[PDB]
Design an enzyme around this catalytic site. Structure first.
Site, short mmCIF file in Angstrom:
data_model
loop_
_atom_site.label_atom_id
_atom_site.label_comp_id
_atom_site.label_asym_id
_atom_site.label_seq_id
_atom_site.Cartn_x
_atom_site.Cartn_y
_atom_site.Cartn_z
N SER A 171 0.01 16.49 -11.39
CA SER A 171 -0.16 15.92 -13.12
C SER A 171 -0.83 17.13 -13.95
O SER A 171 -1.18 18.26 -13.29
CB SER A 171 -1.24 14.90 -13.28
OG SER A 171 -1.79 14.84 -14.42
N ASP A 229 0.70 -1.40 0.02
CA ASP A 229 0.02 0.10 -0.15
C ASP A 229 0.95 1.17 -0.08
O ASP A 229 1.41 1.71 1.06
CB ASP A 229 -0.91 -0.22 1.39
CG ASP A 229 -1.84 1.10 1.15
OD1 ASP A 229 -2.12 1.91 0.20
OD2 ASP A 229 -2.34 1.41 2.28
#
EC number: 3.4.23.22
Lengths: 6, 330
Positions: free
Chosen positions: B199, B35
């Protein structure tokens, strides 16, 4: 579904 | 020192990915859910309440000659899931794909949520975010990656998730075999303790790329792609029948429909998620309504690049003094 920290 | 382990989806929907890891001496092999958006190594165990384990493999610290109580040490973790786990803590030897780490904190669950007991294929989690998120007290512990760093050839792991298929976690090296073209590296903010990056925009299908900064987290621990309401609306606008449902709690679309691809920007580069990855099948067995794999971030407070986006890329977590995130095409 999983939604890994809060 | 390197290590490669095969990661395998747990269902045909690719809800999650499990990797075998070796704990204790001699070794007990547990399937863990790697994770990168938490920082705790926790496992079902001989201490787990027996009304809360249901087909999971448990870690029996009493059978490990490397295992030692961390006296007074204690943990409690809460996920965006609403998922909960808590208990006490051991040190032990932990191996992943032949990379061995001794005195790893292994957090033994006394207590585990419904969500976890219900999931028989997951024996615990291995957190690979930054250690500041670790939950053990009074002494915070470090993550398996942090405990390996120094021993590694390069202080780096890659993620190469497969779509309906196994893939690989590599530690200590970059398999130039596994991706196509160039790796584009982008800045990571560690400030909240996540693999947090920014992004540079998006396109929906064969449409025009909109340059817009989207901040979110690389999280192999989350199934879906979570993006702002604005972006997710543009996506499903292109799918006839798609609507947001109060009932089911997310965008659904008619299973018969055709998902357009989704493009995200990493620097000047572009990663297309094929529309097939965005189908998570009928919201219920028999239903002709299907669950979308791009949903709104508006209720989490963070945008999450989860398995749906990472499985479309070969991803490098450069965990140097100045951490960076690489994406390549595969």
């Amino acid at each position: 579904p999983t939604e890994x920290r809060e | 020192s390197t290590g490669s382990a095969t990661t395998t989806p747990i269902d045909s929907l690719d809800d999650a990915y499990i990797t075998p890891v070796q704990i204790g001496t001699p070794a007990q092999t547990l399937n863990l859910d790697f994770d990168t958006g938490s920082s705790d190594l926790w496992v079902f165990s001989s201490e787990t309440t027996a009304s809360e384990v249901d087909g999971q493999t448990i870690y029996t610290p009493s059978k490990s000659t490397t295992a030692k109580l961390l006296s007074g040490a204690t943990w409690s973790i809460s996920y965006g899931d609403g998922s909960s786990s808590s208990g006490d803590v051991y040190t032990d030897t932990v191996s992943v794909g032949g990379l061995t780490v001794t005195g790893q904190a292994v957090e033994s669950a006394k207590k585990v949520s419904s969500s976890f007991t219900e999931d028989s294929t997951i024996d615990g989690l291995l957190g690979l975010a930054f250690s500041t998120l670790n939950t053990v007290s009074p002494t915070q512990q470090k993550t398996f990656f942090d405990n390996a760093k120094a021993s590694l050839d390069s202080p780096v792991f890659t993620a190469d998730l497969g779509y309906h298929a196994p893939g690989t976690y590599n530690f200590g090296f970059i398999d130039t075999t596994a991706y196509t073209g160039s790796i584009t590296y982008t800045a990571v903010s560690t400030k909240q303790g996540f693999w947090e990056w920014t992004s540079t925009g998006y396109a929906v299908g064969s449409g025009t790329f909109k340059s817009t900064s989207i901040d979110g987290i690389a999280d192999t621990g989350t199934t879906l792609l979570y993006l702002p309401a604005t972006v997710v609306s543009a996506y499903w606008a292109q799918v006839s029948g798609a609507k947001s449902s109060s009932s089911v709690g997310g965008y659904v679309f008619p299973c018969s429909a055709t998902l357009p691809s989704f493009t995200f920007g990493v620097g000047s580069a572009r990663i297309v998620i094929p529309g097939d990855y965005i189908d998570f099948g009928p919201i219920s067995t028999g239903s002709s309504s299907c669950f979308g794999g791009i949903q709104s971030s508006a209720g989490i407070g963070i945008n999450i690049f989860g398995d749906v986006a990472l499985k479309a890329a070969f991803v490098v977590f450069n965990g140097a003094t100045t951490p960076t995130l690489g994406f390549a095409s595969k």
